[PDB]
Amino acid sequence: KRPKSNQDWWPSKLNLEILDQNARDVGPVEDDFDYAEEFQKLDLEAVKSDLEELMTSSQDWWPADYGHYGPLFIRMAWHSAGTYRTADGRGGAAGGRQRFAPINSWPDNANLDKARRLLLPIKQKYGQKISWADLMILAGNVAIESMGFKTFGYAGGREDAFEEDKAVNWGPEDEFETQERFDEPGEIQEGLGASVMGLIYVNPEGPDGNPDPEASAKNIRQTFDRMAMNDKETAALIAGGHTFGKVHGADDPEENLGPEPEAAPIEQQGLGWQNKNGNSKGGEMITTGIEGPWTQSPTEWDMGYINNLLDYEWEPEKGPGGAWQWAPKSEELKNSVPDAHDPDEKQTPMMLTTDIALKRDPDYREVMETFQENPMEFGMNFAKAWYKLTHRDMGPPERFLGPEVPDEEMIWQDPLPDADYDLIGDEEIAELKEEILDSDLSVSQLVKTAWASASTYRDSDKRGGANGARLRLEPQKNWEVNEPEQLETVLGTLENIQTEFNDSRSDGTQVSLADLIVLGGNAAVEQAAANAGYDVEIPFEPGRVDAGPEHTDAPSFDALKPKVDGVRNYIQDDITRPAEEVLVDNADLLNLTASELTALIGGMRSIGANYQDTDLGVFTDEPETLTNDFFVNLLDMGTEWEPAADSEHRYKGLDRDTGEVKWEATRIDLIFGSNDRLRAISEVYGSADAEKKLVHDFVDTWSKVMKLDRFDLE
Amino acid sequence: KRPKSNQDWWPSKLNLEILDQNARDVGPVEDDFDYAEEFQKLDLEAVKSDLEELMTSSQDWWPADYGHYGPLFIRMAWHSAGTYRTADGRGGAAGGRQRFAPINSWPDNANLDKARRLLLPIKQKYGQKISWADLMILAGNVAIESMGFKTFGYAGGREDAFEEDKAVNWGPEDEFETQERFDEPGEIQEGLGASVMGLIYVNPEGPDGNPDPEASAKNIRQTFDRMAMNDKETAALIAGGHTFGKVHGADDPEENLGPEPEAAPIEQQGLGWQNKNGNSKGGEMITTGIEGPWTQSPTEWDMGYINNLLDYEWEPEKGPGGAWQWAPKSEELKNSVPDAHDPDEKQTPMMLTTDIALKRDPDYREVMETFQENPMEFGMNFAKAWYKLTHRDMGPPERFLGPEVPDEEMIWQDPLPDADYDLIGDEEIAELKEEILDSDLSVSQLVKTAWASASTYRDSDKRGGANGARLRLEPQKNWEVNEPEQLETVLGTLENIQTEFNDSRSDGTQVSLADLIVLGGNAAVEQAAANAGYDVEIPFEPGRVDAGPEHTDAPSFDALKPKVDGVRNYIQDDITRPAEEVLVDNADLLNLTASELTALIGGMRSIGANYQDTDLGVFTDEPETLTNDFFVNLLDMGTEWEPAADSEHRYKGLDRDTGEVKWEATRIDLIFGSNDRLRAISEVYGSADAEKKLVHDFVDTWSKVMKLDRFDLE
Ligand code: HEM
Ligand code: HEM
């Protein structure tokens, strides 16, 4: 048989495997392989041209609906991106992870295995010059254009992954298609982008299986919100999407379909959901168990969805697949649509409960009425929403590659202004460094501030970072954890230095505040390393610009607000998970390994950049002196730890003999002396001959983070 | 709140996580770090001195029994190495994985956490000069020595790991201290080195908690047997070991012992089994539940154990912990032992069912009585057994470091003779290759033999390999998988070449057959790459020697016989687990990553090197031509797969269109097209631009395997 993981014996075991994924890069791709350069060689048109032909080139193992694969492809692209949550920036189409488990075997993704397979020849024909990730999205764009609708634009740059993202928590559900995340529609558990396990957003039949339109709209609203989309956008996407294709439910899924890809027989070769009677189906295709098309020309762009929905009355019912769907009360629409694979046959259009919801909900109804009224208005709303949906997790404008990239930059891209001046030289740097070090700013003020600036970055959707100095703008400048008043004192001193330096210059040379913040932090760290007798030259990359409120959709940054900050030992008093889990989860967003996280926090405590300047976890007598004191003192058996009475996050380190309190700390600090893998790393650094190693590891990690968002020069 | 791994949703999903461990090296240690080197700097004498000192430096947080930690440390090293199994070479102490879960939290390791803790100060003092793995075994040694007994020797070199070995399969059970592996004592499930999940070998209370000295001996023998130990060794170890220390269990641990390390509070800093009524008590100490010493002088080496067990008779009785144990029927030995912690108290000796199993079982008594007669024979066997027990998973002599390594090289180290001649230069290396390609031996044959010669290497215990050429000796020359008669022929031709080469040498240069075997493969791989238009030169390391049958424990090599071999597509028709699972398991013994495996096999099928020259998986038109034809043809949807009629491992690839039989394959071939992650790699290599990459990735993987045992170069 198979082994048994440690998570099985102890459920609460810290999941450090998410950090290990950051150590190596599974897959056969070279380390020095620059995907950007490869795509830069791709001939996008030839690919789009080939996809054009595929659109109507039906293979027998999965005959095209209406002799056109367009609709199916669209559903595939939309699902590839639709798993995206704003809370952590994970999911999405950035890695093309729909291809790996568990996503590839999600109920909602039924038969998308066949759609991906169809792209296999083209994918092999261009090879590394196009990722599955970029390809699935482009397959949607081409599909949409081929059926008569122009797209706002397209961009390449999405690098394929070679495994699932272990960091993503898809929910508490223990079974697919079931939910334990909401008691009332619109009341889903924090951080989740769906209302049901295995589904992209909501249950197509209605909440909890009930054909309640009004209720459906509440979950549609919340789920989409948690995906960075409003009413206009949601309505446009749902309506523009269902303008094409159909839903397949010839018969009940729970009896006619085989195991999902992951549970399928090896001779299936990655496919799954094999239909008992056959998979080369047409008039018997089953996907979700719901049957029928939405419009009269499922392969053409038009006002078919909106007109069918708004101009006719619909009644709930049980379809041939035994699932909820709606039909018209009139005989006008009956048999007005040709059968997906048959000539001598017509089909009556249908409507999902989630569709009736755009009509029953009063706000979705205004928006929909507007659209029906102005096709041009609905067209662009859909064009722009589609473009945002499929590029939302790619990062700033610098990352979007190719000839079809819109000259216009959207706000959600968190655009950065150009630096219209000359970059400071090696001489100005040392100059400004001393200037800063001469101010009344402590090493802890400079470190804390630079940490607040760069720590907002998250590798999941390439958002945040220290470039742009958004830390001084809303909402970051007012986040509790950034100690607003404290931050203001520091930012003032730096802005003055920026002004003074900018004025005295007589050659167009200027220095951005965003740049000074980080530099002032490298200086503080160097100084802390100097107070311990270590000469270190921290690499500084000048070039960061200062973004303005006009380049910041303030409300969207609230998503990057940390609930826990290891480095500053901050724990919001309401988190559900234990501090350490969030610690690890946040660490993963900064691409840290268990070791890098360990060196960071450890080195930090010796310095003392704590929130509200506490001493929690500061196991040293010489603060602002970079040493391995944290590990040495933490591991001292002479000291014993116990929870602090009437405390929720505080712990006391007592002398096992005298009983006297020696230190105070949190789970963030203690986790490195309890978890077996981490304690093992704390022993290396806590050894008598490793201080220099720690100093250097801490610096490396500190430098890595400061530059995380420096995409332009990667 | 934690990501529900793909493991739960699909309990049968291939576990590629073990191959992922080979892609990266978790832990804060530099790539260019040579432990064996940092070790050479270590003043071993200083370490031993501090170790003997620590032996009588009791810590208030865990008082030293009898005022000496020696016995406890002996157990620590005992359990540290006693988890080794010859079947896969896993377990052991060569990595010191006792520190990591699940091992560190196994019921049989209760309180061993305090034992490893007592060694923290020392480990810290010496840092990278001594690994935890080497320190634990060195502590057991030093523990015995200070108790009047010299050790046969000691060798450092065990590299510290920073995580468990996810590749180890400890058993099918779903709970600790319960077994579902054996009905009758001695009918244990093959592949397992213990009779009960969570134990090192067996249950100290006898099979299923039943004090049946006879049945206990039946398992005591199969366990030690599966751990490379015979009767004499089994008796000496157990007896010599129990000549020290006692068994603790003042009360029932089932109700007086806190959570095990992994499930203990964070304040307990990695420690576990917190005594409910005072952990610093000492007098009140609970570990396994059984209470009492074996000898009247627990801190003195002598015949106390064998004397008490043989000179008197014992009877069953539930001890002060609810566990089965024995005591003297006669009241002569009553209070013959001083109390471990109470200066004003005495205590009566006790024996475990495992200690009575040695008296009852025939072949055991014979040994025990021979020992009692000759105290020296007991010594020579125990000393040598203790040395074999703590070093058998470290590899050949090449890997034994330090100033205390015995000069006499043991048989279990699988010694290799010294080349008594001059190596061959690039000049001769070139000739030899051109000469092997002039023979009538085909690429297939050459490639196949080289693989048979090296594939036996396993990273777990560093055994097997192409150096020594055991392939031509017993038992390997007669392994079904090697095709004896075929192997016979190939070697003959190679030997004739070795001959004609050595005889023509006007100097002292001579070529081993071992080198020639590997030099044949390399040249054959280059030829195959040449027929594909790629000119490649594989790096070759001359210097291997030919081992003789004299210094070869033929029987102990059966554990290296594989039941599956993807390169040659060999599948034993008795393997319980699915072929692909074994394929992965073995690939881990070779330290290959998902990618490497994939390239290896895919490239190999284009060459055609199957067991019995079958056309299984050979999806190519031009064999012995290294290309990416395997991936191109495995991925072609124009082909459909299905299980073969009346065949266990066979699958046929028909033409979706015609229905004509296109290819034939086995799960080993088809897995690369079914598993999500593996398929991701196959698509890379099967692209219209991957061939050259595959050829190079193939050579590098092949070149790697050929050198797995070349420690001498490391
Ligand atoms: C409130 C969120 C929505 C709900 C619950 C939902 C619903 C569903 C259901 C149940 C199906 C049928 C699949 C099948 O049986 O084959 C389908 C697909 C389809 N979806 Fe939607 N979806 C949502 C929206 C979106 C968006 C946001 C768009 C695209 C911008 C779009 C896309 C399409 C197209 C083109 C098809 C038909 C594919 C074909 O004919 O193969 N969907 N959807
Ligand atoms: C069939 C195999 C054996 C069984 C099931 C077994 C049994 C046990 C158990 C139940 C304990 C006591 C744990 C406790 O209460 O603290 C103990 C330990 C002890 N064992 Fe064994 N053992 C085997 C053999 C061996 C071997 C081969 C060695 C090492 C050469 C060894 C040496 C020791 C020592 C020195 C102690 C006492 C530790 C102390 O004072 O704290 N044993 N054993």
Q: Which of B62, B79, B242, B347 should be mutated for ligand 2, with most atoms under 8 A from CB?
A: B242
B contact residues 253-312, partner A, Cβ 8 Å cutoff: 261-264, 266-270
Asked if A599 lies within 8 A of B28 by C-beta distance, the reply is yes
How far off is chain B from A470, nearest CA to CA, in Å?
31
What is the four-CA torsion angle of A275, A276, A280, A284, rounded to 10 degrees?
-70
B237: left (phi > 0), else alpha (psi -120 to 50), else beta? alpha
Nearest to A140 by CA among A35, A51, A23: A51
Q: How is residue A24 written in tokens? A: 């190596």
Closest partner CB to B676 (pick from A99, A598, A690): A99
Rounded distance between C-alpha atoms, residue A651 and residue A390, angstroms: 46
Distance CA(A413)–CA(A269), nearest Å, equals 38
Task: Give the CA diameter of chain A.
Answer: 93
Q: Which two tokens stand for residue B144?
A: 């015995």
CB B446 within 8 A of CB B521: yes
Query: How far is the C-alpha of A395 from the C-alpha of A400, rounded, in Å?
Result: 8
Tell which CATH architecture fits domain A564-692.
Orthogonal Bundle (1.10)
**SS3 at position A698:** helix
Pair B514, B437: CB distance under 8 Å: no
Distance CA B268, CA A673 (A): 9
Residue among A54, A116, A163 with most chain B CBs within 10 A, to mutate: A163
State phi, psi for A281 to the nearest 5 degrees: -65, 165
Q: How far apart are CA A593 and CA B583, in angstroms?
A: 29
Q: Provide the H-helix boundaries in B186-283.
A: 213-225, 231-241, 253-256
Candidate CATH numbers 1.10.10.60, 1.10.420.10, 1.20.120.1150, 1.10.760.10; the one for domain B216-249+286-385: 1.10.420.10
Among A79, A248, A391, A649, the one annotated catalytic: A79
Local structure of B508: helix, strand or coil: coil
* Chain B hits for A170, Cβ within 8 Å: 3-4
B60 contacts on A by Cβ (under 8 Å): 656-657
Q: CA-to-CA distance for B449 and B472, rounded, in angstroms?
A: 10
Residue whose tokens read 């396994």: B288
Residues in chain B: 714
> Do A582 and A601 meet the contact criterion of CB atoms below 8 Å apart?
no
Query: What is the crossing angle of helices B513-530 and B443-454, to 10°?
Result: 130
Q: Identify each DSSP E strand in B308-366 by its residue range.
A: 314-318, 324-328, 337-338, 346-347
Quick one: DSSP state of residue A677? H
Distance, CA of A160 to CA of A136 (rounded, Å): 11
- Tell whether A598 lies on the interface with B, counting CB pairs under 8 A: yes
First to last CA, chain A: 45
DSSP state of B356: H
Greatest alpha-carbon span in chain B: 93
Please give the structure tokens belonging to residue A503.
């004025």
Whether B26 and A60 lie within 8 Å, measured CB to CB = no
Q: Determine how many CB atoms are found less than 10 A away from the CB of residue B584.
A: 25
Phi-psi region of B613 (alpha: psi -120 to 50; beta: other; left: phi over 0): left
Give the closest residue to B644 by CA, choosing from B632, B656, B654, B652. B652
Q: Are B347 and B335 in contact (CB under 8 A)?
A: yes
Pick the closest to residue B225 from B102, B363, B75, B109 (CA basis): B363
Residue B60's Cβ-count burial label (10 Å; 0-12, 13-18, 19+) is exposed
Bond preceding residue B102 cis, omega within 30 of 0 = yes
End-to-end CA distance of chain B: 45
Question: A 653-682 residues with CB below 8 A of B?
Answer: 656-657, 667, 670-671, 673-677, 679-681
B494 touches chain A (CB under 8 A): no
Domains A216-249+286-385 and A564-692 share a fold: yes
Cα–Cα distances (Å) from B428 to A292, B423, B450, B544, in that order, read 75, 9, 19, 15
How far is Cα of residue A283 from the mean position of the Cα atoms in its chain? 38
Is the Cβ–Cβ distance between A110 and A257 less than 8 Å? yes
Beta carbons within 8 Å of A482's beta carbon, 6+ residues apart: A452, A471, A476
| CA–CA gap between residue B597 and residue B694 (Å, rounded) | 12
Q: How far is CA B712 from the centre of its chain?
A: 20
CA distance A568 to A348: 62
Residues annotated within a binding site of A for heme b: 242
The residue among B672, B674, B696 with the most chain A CBs within 10 A of its CB, best to mutate, is: B674
Report which protein residue has its CA nearest ligand 2's atom 4: B204
Place of tokens 């009047």: B148
Which residues line ligand 1 at a C-beta cut-off of 6 Å? A 65, 71-72, 74-75, 78, 201-202, 204, 220, 237-238, 240-242, 244-249, 287-288, 290, 352, 354, 386
Q: Does an H or E element contain B652, and which? A: strand B651-655
Query: Residue B599 corresponds to which amino acid?
Result: A
Please provide residue B246's backbone torsions phi and psi, each rounded to the nearest 5 degrees.
-140, 180
Distance, in Å, from the CA atom of A477 to the CA atom of A510, rounded to the nearest integer, reads 24
The string of DSSP letters for B253-290 reads HHHHB---GGGS-GGGTT----BTT-SS-SSS-BSSS-
Report the C-alpha gap between A425 and B59 in whole angstroms: 59
Tokens of B508: 């002292």
The ligand with the least distance to the CA atom of A68 is 1
Experimental approach was: X-ray
Ligand 1 atom closest to the CA of A357, numbered from 1: 1
> Cα torsion for A6, A8, A12, A16, to the nearest 10°?
40
Q: Are A278 and A258 in contact (CB under 8 A)?
A: no
Find out whether B527 and B546 touch, Cβ atoms under 8 Å.
Answer: no
Our measurement of the distance from residue A229's CA atom to the centroid of its chain's CA atoms, rounded to an integer in Å, reads 14
The span from the CA of B268 to the CA of B261, in Å, is 8
- Report yes or no: A170 and A424 within 8 Å, Cβ to Cβ: no
Distance from CA of B587 to the nearest CA of A (A): 15
**Residue position matching structure tokens 């034809």:** B629
Of the bound ligands, which one is closest to the alpha carbon of residue A364?
1
- On whether the CB atoms of residues B29 and B387 are closer than 8 A, the answer is no
Query: How far, in Å, CA of B369 to CA of A359, rounded?
Result: 93
Q: Kind and range of the H or E element at B358?
A: helix B353-360
Quick count: other Cβ atoms within 10 Å of Cβ A453?
30
> Do B260 and B272 contact (CB within 8 A), yes or no?
yes
What tokens were used for A329? Answer: 């009360």
Whether A343 contacts A386, CB under 8 Å: no
Cβ A470 vs Cβ A476: under 8 Å: yes
Upper half-sphere CA count for residue A193 (Cβ side, 13 Å): 24
Contacts of range A266-269, beta carbons closer than 8 Å, 24 or more positions apart: A266/B580, A266/B651, A266/B667, A266/B670, A266/B671, A266/B674, A267/B641, A267/B642, A267/B643, A267/B651, A267/B670, A267/B674, A268/B641, A268/B674, A269/B641, A269/B670, A269/B673, A269/B674, A269/B679
Position A557: which residue type? Answer: F
**A595 at the B interface (CB within 8 A)?**
yes
Q: How many CA atoms lie within 13 A of B330 on its CB side?
A: 7
d(CA B522, CA A432): 60
- How do the domains of chain B map onto residue ranges? 36-165+386-397, 216-249+286-385, 419-563+693-714, 564-692
Task: Note whether A164 contacts B: Cβ–Cβ < 8 A.
Answer: yes
Query: Cβ separation of A687 and B127 shorter than 8 Å?
Result: yes
List the B639-643 sheet strands across, edge first: B639-643, B651-655, B661-665
For the Cβ of B386 lying below 6 angstroms from any atom of ligand 2, the answer is yes
> How many A from CA of A253 to the centre of ligand 1?
17
d(C-alpha B325, C-alpha B340), whole Å: 19
Beta bridge partners of A663: A653
Q: Name the closest-CA residue to atom 40, ligand 2.
A: B245
Retrieve residue B118's tokens: 């007592």
Nearest residue to B459 via CA among B95, B15, B59, B44 = B95
Q: In this structure, are strands A639-643 and A246-247 parallel, antiparallel, or unpaired?
A: unpaired
Closest Cβ opposite residue A262 in set B10, B126, B641 = B10
Give yes or no for a contact between B706 and B522, defined as CB atoms under 8 angstroms apart.
Answer: yes
In DSSP notation, B549-615 reads STT--GGGGGGG--SEETTTTEE-TT-SS-HHHHHHHHHHHTT--HHHHHHHHHHHHHH---GGG--
- As a residue count, chain A comes to 714
Topology of the domain covering B36-165+386-397: Peroxidase; domain 1 (1.10.520)
Q: Which residues pair with B640 in a beta bridge?
A: B654
Q: Between chains, do B163 and A677 touch, taking CB under 8 Å as contact?
A: yes
The identity of residue B394, as a single letter, is: M
* Interface touch A170/B4, C-beta < 8 Å: yes
Instruction: List the structure tokens of A202.
Output: 């909501």
- Distance from the Cα of A106 to chain B's closest Cα (Å) equals 11
- In degrees to the nearest 10, what's the CA dihedral of B242, B244, B245, B247? 10
Backbone angles phi, psi at B62, to 5 degrees: 175, 75
Cis peptide before B475 (omega within 30 of 0): yes
- Per DSSP, helices labelled H in B55-111 are 70-81
Is any Cβ of chain A less than 8 angstroms from the Cβ of B12? yes
Distance CA B376, CA A105 (A): 66
For domain A419-563+693-714, give the fold: Peroxidase; domain 1 (1.10.520)
Are B249 and B290 a contacting pair, CB within 8 Å? yes
The Cα-based distances of A518 to A432, A467, A561, A606 in angstroms read: 12, 9, 19, 20
Say if residue B242 carries a ligand binding annotation.
yes
| Angular region, A493: left φ>0, alpha ψ -120 to 50, beta rest | alpha
Three-state secondary structure call for residue B402:
strand
CB A664, CB A649: distance < 8 Å: no
For residue A661, give the amino acid letter: V
Cα distance between residue A622 and residue B520, in whole Å: 64
Give the DSSP H/E element, type plus range, for residue B641: strand B639-643
Atom of ligand 2 nearest to the CA of B82: 27
Position B674: which residue type? S
- A79 a catalytic residue: yes
Distance CA A711, CA A399 (A): 7
Mark which residues 623-642 of A lie under 8 Å from B by CB. 635, 637, 640-642
Alpha-carbon gap, residue B126 to A682, rounded angstroms:
15
Q: For residues A169 and A53, what is the distance between their CA atoms, to the nearest angstrom? A: 39
CA B310 to centroid of chain Cα atoms = 35
3-state class (DSSP) for residue A266: helix
* Distance between CA atoms of residues A712 and A423, nearest Å: 15
In this structure, the number of other CB atoms found within 10 A of the CB of residue A430 comes to: 12
DSSP state at residue A156: B
Strands in B228-323 per DSSP E: 246-247, 292-293, 314-318
Q: How far apart are the C-alpha atoms of A170 and A87, rounded to whole Å?
A: 12
Instruction: Say if residues B652 and B663 touch (Cβ distance below 8 Å).
Output: yes
What beta strand segments (E) does A570-683 contain?
A: 570-571, 639-643, 651-655, 661-665
φ/ψ of residue B9, rounded to 5: -65, -35
The experimental resolution of this structure, in angstroms, equals: 2.3
